[model samples]
Target: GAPATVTEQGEDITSKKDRGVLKIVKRVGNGEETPMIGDKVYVHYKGKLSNGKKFDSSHDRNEPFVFSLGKGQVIKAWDIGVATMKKGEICHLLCKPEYAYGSAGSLPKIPSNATLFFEIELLDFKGE
Candidate 1:
């Protein structure tokens, strides 16, 4: 049997419900430290289109991606989903178009208004 999806809310944010952001937990992590805004976070992620066609992957590059949370350095789905994650947690996020690239597609790989699915693993984070 697998762990059930985590329905627990991680942080207080406005776009979660209305934007249709979905988080499906795969591995639970320690609750001691959730990532805070402005903190630099490190994660490994694989992104795919609705058709399950892979678009990007940190694993393929053999490196983890780092970014500042709540800083608009990535898509809206990442900002929200990553914030909710506990260190070491692995989860899948289903991102709606509004939370992703929107009408103007990310050239070459992602198409316009594409709904993205991401498998993410939070490796670590630290304050600036």
Candidate 2:
């Protein structure tokens, strides 16, 4: 595969599959299998706004976030970005509003139609 590209602003790096809405960049590569749709994926992540405001972080709680790969438990970007990750791989994901909370954002921490940035590390996964 070719090297990753940068955002339109020419700062943030993104993978080939990144289509503006969800910018994905592999921070740490791991040569392993990716999870299937029904797999329970475990990850530690830090989520923030475009202005670098910290919103939520699993590292603060010292516990990984667990969810099914293709489930609607989380945001759309997470489902798409997390699915591309290999075990132990760390990725930086920049999610647009459409892929994130949309017009109705998560209250208190996130504002309406806010873009989010996330650094997620895939710890493990379990099959059904």
Candidate 3:
């Protein structure tokens, strides 16, 4: 079956609801102890909306995203979520509206107060 079409407004509402009910299965590490400011990190991720609708994925890209943790280079949830994970670890994060796009969501795809899910794998961390 083909994937369902998701409207920007609907996606935003779903995202918001999904994030609100987010519960962590495990706490591998805390944000303060894992990734730090200026730490270059590599991560693989799959992003999807509620109702099993995929929005974006690093797996599709076949290239992990590299960025400095705790820096304002990416979304708030990414900075916070990645910082809580160690290298070579995987985490599933439920991003709330405040953590994600707030009143104004990312155009064309995301809507206002959108919630998002991220299945993230910490591939590497450059820090000694």
Candidate 4:
């Protein structure tokens, strides 16, 4: 399920919606099931800052990451963005700082209050 705040107003200063919280750049699924809370998700993704600077990537690690959906296990963007996706779907999610690291960004590459961008490909997931 999408976040209440994100789906409520659907307004933002940028071209994207959810008050610029997130945007679906693409969806490559064939009507498969969308993820729900507690589902174990596996994905290959690349992260970047607003300036297009690469930050992190699952490819870089040569292994995709796994996390349980909607457990606050990851960032709010991942929970919200991936919630809107289906199996085998690929998308670019642009997230505002509020939905990202916000006041304290991730160490090293990300700066404080930086907007995060990512190319996410949902490889597979195990339902709860």
Residue 23 lDDT (model 1): 77
Q: List residue ranges in candidate 4 displaced over 4 A.
A: 1-18
Best by lDDT: 1
Q: What is each predicted model's overall lDDT from 0 to 1?
A: 0.82, 0.75, 0.66, 0.76
Stretches off by above 4 angstroms in model 2 are 1-20
Q: What TM-score against the true fold does each predicted structure earn?
A: 0.87, 0.82, 0.72, 0.81
Task: For candidate 4, write residues 1-128 as lDDT tens digits.
Answer: 22233334333324344565555546678585888899999999998776768899999999999999989999888888888788889877767788888889888889999877778999888876
Candidate 2 global CA lDDT score: 0.75
- Model 4 per-residue lDDT at 104: 95
Candidate 2 lDDT, 69-128, residue by residue in tens: 888889888888888888888877777787789999888888998877778899999997
Candidate 4: TM-score?
Answer: 0.81
Residue 123 lDDT, candidate 1, scale 0-100: 98
- Model 3 lDDT on a 0 to 1 scale: 0.66
- Tell me the TM-score of model 3: 0.72
Candidate 4 minimal-lDDT segment of 10 residues: 1-10
> How many Å off is the CA of 78 in candidate 2?
0.4
Candidate 1 runs further than 4 Å off: 1-16
Error of 4 at 5 (Å): 23
Residue pairs with colliding backbones in model 2 are: none
